[PDB]
Amino acid sequence: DFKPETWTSSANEALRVSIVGENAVQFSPLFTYPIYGDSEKIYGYKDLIIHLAFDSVTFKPYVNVKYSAKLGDDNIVDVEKKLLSFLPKDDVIVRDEAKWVDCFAEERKTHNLSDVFEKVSEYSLNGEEFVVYKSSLVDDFARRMHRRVQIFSLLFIEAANYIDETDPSWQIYWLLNKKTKELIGFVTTYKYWHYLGAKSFDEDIDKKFRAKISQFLIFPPYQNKGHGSCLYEAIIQSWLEDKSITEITVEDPNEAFDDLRDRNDIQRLRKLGYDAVFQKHSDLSDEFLESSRKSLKLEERQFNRLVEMLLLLNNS
Amino acid sequence: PLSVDEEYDLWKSNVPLMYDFVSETRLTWPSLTVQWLPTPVQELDGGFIKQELIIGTHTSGEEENYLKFAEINLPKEILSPRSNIRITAKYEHEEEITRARYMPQDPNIVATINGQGTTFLYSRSEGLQSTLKFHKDNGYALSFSTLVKGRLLSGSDDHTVALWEVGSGGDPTKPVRTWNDLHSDIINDNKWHNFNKDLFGTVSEDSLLKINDVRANNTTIDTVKCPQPFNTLAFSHHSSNLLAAAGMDSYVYLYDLRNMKEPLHHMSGHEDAVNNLEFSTHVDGVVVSSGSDNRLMMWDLKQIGAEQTPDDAEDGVPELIMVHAGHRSSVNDFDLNPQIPWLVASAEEENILQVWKCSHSLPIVG
Amino acid sequence: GKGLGKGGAKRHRKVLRDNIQGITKPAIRRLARRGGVK
Ligand SMILES: CC(C)(COP(=O)(O)OP(=O)(O)OC[C@H]1O[C@@H](n2cnc3c(N)ncnc32)[C@H](O)[C@@H]1OP(=O)(O)O)[C@@H](O)C(=O)NCCC(=O)NCCS
Predict the structure, then answer these.
(1) Which single residue of A193, B351, B355, C21 could bond B264 by disulfide (Cβ 3.0 to 4.6 Å)?
(2) Family assignment (chain C) (predicted)?
(3) CB contact, 8 Å: B363 with chain A?
């Protein structure tokens, strides 16, 4: 039977994203619209399969496009060229799998992020150690890596955009398996000047900042194991220690990030003894609440949600 | 893709929700300049509140030019609707008035600069008093010190800056200091600091911003390379270290005098060159800008970097408080009323003067 | 887009408004920022 409808496919299904370590782990993107258009459909290819694959350590990318047949046409999109335009120029291996393997084998011999970058913290999870590193985006090595993983922001975070790597206010956190050196996820963060009024600004020469979580990603093979929470806590803790940071903020968080943030913030509050503080009848002077929120470095809206929650939760 | 007139009509339909008050007036000739006088609020018979405004003409050589003083009689609710407006004095002026500024310590005195760079001193009660000739070309830069009576700075398309002292006695018609060495192109603006009586800033088409001391032999204490030329700058009325500057690239930049090496931040919103900038005297952190995109924008520096919801971020950066889209051509000048917080007068290229106050429901007015 | 990592377009604009509550107080704020010309 003639099925010309099979020459039109879902971009989300055709695109096979693979992270290759000891094994090839394959999964689907959540979004393709910034690559293949708003309908996320591809026309003119029968049995289309788009392989996008990354070494689990170096994230050296590989692209291979396959189909049983294709409409020779100019109106027909060049699927491969499209995808390559969102990947680093001349850093992607095309079709030749053996060539790709030879490449990242040699790279794995060279230095890890953990040799170049600044170490932030460590944690154990599932009976395994992980390390959080941070870096700027001006570093040539950090740029090489961030260009490799960038596309994951487009494929997994709605309305993501590629950030300005020339902007020195960008700081990136890298989550690594400590023994295997595999990249578990990454977080792009930014700092904005925080004006605290003339008196404060005139009194301290040291610039103050609101730190912002922008793109927060744990790769799909590694999700739902606690990594998101641990990484979030690692970053927040380093920001609590950073004198220049006044507030922790997040860019357009989704529901899943909302819940992660709330769960960790609450747990931090209880740990610091704030269950005993936030009671209906506690002394809660305006300057104490101000002092409290600043100590906590919590964003104002988030702070109020949290206090309201604690009042309701321990009551009731 | 609304035309200018379709967008105006849309703006007009939303005025009752966005504003406590808007008055719109067509002038017979454009004014290149706008400034509220510091006349104290006074309620008149009929329940109107008197304020006063300085404007000028630009007749393009067709008729006599005039420095004008207007009585703006506002509805009483403006303090918490329509106004009467009355031109109470007109004084003949040589060429167009590009800038007119009252002397803070004696607002009977008003300085002007014209299309040939000549500076004049006018008395409200007696008319033209003095002609201060140094600059040889059109000048847009003119600023009186709030800290030293009669200390006046002017700057010109001829690349030169002059310091005048017109508040003492004696003859004020000769500059006390001049600079041919500050900039190598048009002086776009010069302004006095609000706390250090000896500090002023200049911006030029040569893409430099300079911080200067009138006492120093070498003058300049800091030199800043501007991304593209700045047209204007302004100093905080609350912080002795904070200033703003803006121009061709459309962004409003903030600077710390203690470390001019790089901007604190830049605020995006304008879609064309920014031409004027002012800090609020009433609220620490509030900045207002105008530009060639026909807009005025009000900014809250205390919201820079604030967290937003996605729908909120779609309307602009958090520091953006409000956009005035009442004008249908580039904004020539605007002034924040020093007696009535949030009252603004702004004039556009095509003969319109608007007097307006944003909604008191906006969180920033509290 | 200073420091923006999620400043791109969404897949689709939403059709149902959670803000039929206009002509309220936060509605004024959004109107003001849009300059009443959206
Ligand atoms: C979130 C992500 C990091 C996974 O990491 P994670 O720490 O394992 O988070 P989890 O999904 O396991 O959630 C923690 C679990 O603790 C448990 N939990 C315990 N108490 C809970 C409570 N009070 N409330 C809800 N969950 C609770 C739940 O099982 C919870 O899972 P759930 O909330 O999803 O149902 C990953 O989804 C990701 O990176 N996704 C895409 C990128 C993205 O969208 N980033 C946000 C935009 S920038």
Answers:
(1) A193
(2) Belongs to the histone H4 family.
(3) no
